[PDB]
């Protein structure tokens, strides 16, 4: 009853038979911007199924020495499908996200992945006074990897990352994690090309292990924007 789940958005659907539950960040659900909170006065465009659908990013391989992976939103989706086109043609965007992380192995495999959505994951640089550059932060669809997951690449602690909305993929228990993210920002809308509201981090707290014949064990991320709206139409910028 809580291990099987189907998510359907637009023309996309996902089914998992080894879920635990799914997390609604801070007990909230995505919604459109209400009139009593709006700032931009132009009529927003709400593409609905054109943008509110699952986009699957490139899979990554879970290796023995893997330190972890991250993707910044909306940066990771800014060049994908109609969501990317709307982002490129509009000065302002707003949306939640539905995140589904997939990783399966055998009953002889072991490992634990922490799947956490970090709001405003401002990254720090290691052993230097220079702030991270644009190329260090904006990785797009490919995402990045943690240099020091122990401190979340920001001088904090991985052990306390559970304060953020998160699930675990414990191979003996489940093969997928689902997190629903509301709009998380100090402003009602934002410029999607210069600010990232959420960071999805997947960190192998317990390394992948087995004594059976080894196989590639990928981790796959599917993200569906929810309640997308865009304001300030102009020419494409990207």
């Amino acid at each position: 009853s809580d291990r099987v789940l189907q998510l359907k958005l637009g023309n996309s659907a996902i089914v998992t038979q080894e879920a635990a539950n799914y997390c609604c960040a801070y007990g909230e659900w995505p919604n459109y911007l209400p009139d009593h909170e709006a700032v931009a006065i132009d009529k927003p465009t709400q593409p609905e199924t054109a943008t509110d659908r699952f986009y699957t990013l490139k899979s990554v391989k879970w290796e023995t020495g893997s330190t972890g992976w991250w993707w910044k939103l909306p940066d990771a989706l800014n060049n994908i499908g109609m969501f990317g086109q709307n982002v490129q043609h509009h000065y302002l965007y707003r949306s939640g996200f539905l995140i589904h992380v997939q990783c399966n192995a055998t009953k002889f495999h072991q490992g634990a992945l922490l799947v956490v959505a970090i709001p405003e994951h401002q990254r720090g640089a290691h052993n230097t006074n220079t702030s991270p550059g644009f190329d260090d932060i904006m990785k797009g669809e490919e995402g990045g990897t943690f240099n020091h997951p122990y401190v979340l690449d920001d001088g904090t602690s991985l052990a306390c990352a559970t304060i953020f909305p998160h699930q675990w993929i414990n191979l003996r228990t489940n093969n997928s994690a689902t997190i629903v993210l509301p709009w998380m920002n100090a402003a009602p809308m934002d410029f999607p090309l210069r600010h990232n509201q959420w960071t999805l981090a997947i960190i192998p707290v317990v390394p992948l292990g087995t004594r059976t014949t080894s196989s590639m064990v990928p981790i796959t991320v599917s993200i569906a924007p929810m309640c997308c709206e865009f304001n300030g139409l102009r020419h494409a910028i990207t």
């Binding site: 700032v39 006065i41 600010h195 020419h235």
Partner: protein, 247 residues
Amino acid sequence: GVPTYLLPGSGQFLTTDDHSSAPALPCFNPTPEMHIPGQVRNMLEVVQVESMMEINNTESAVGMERLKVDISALTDVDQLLFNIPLDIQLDGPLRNTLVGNISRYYTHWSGSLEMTFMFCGSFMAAGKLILCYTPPGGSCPTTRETAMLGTHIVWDFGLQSSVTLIIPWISGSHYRMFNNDAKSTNANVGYVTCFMQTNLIVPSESSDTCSLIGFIAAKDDFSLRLMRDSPDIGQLDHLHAAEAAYQ
């Protein structure tokens, strides 16, 4: 007596404090009030009044020449005529206007602006123009096909000599800031561009060059916050005859 203790800040002189103070002239009767036309109670009433932009702020323009933009007949289509920087804090065409002057006494602003252009050609002159507002994020458009993707009005010259381009308040944040970093995401408003829609066509006896006057004002959704000293005025020495006041 009453036991008391002094708090931090006691005895300070805060220039923005609001207290009663001792009347120096007891029983003084001020002159009775008389109705005077043109009373203003909120400075936002002033910024709502149209004033001319200095669009032609170029070395070749002197005096009031800087307050009009000349347009002539062209032999190529869809040509750009002029653009207008939208930064009030920087020194641009909007700075020496009622809205600009009043706003530069503040740090934050919000609301829609309106640009009105009056065509001052002869009655026989005809033409159509497109006025575009491009929300920020990229470079100022240089071609009509790109500029027309944003907010715009196509203006047909005629009996009504003036058209209004509304610059709607399109902002991620509630307010913007009058900060010297014109490229900051908290300050940049975008661009306004003007292209020929068809052409300026005049008969042989009319002037072949016609002028537009651009006006700007804020709508009644405009507001300002965080009073500050205006950078538009300053002194490095005492003014003449100031010393004579002490003689």
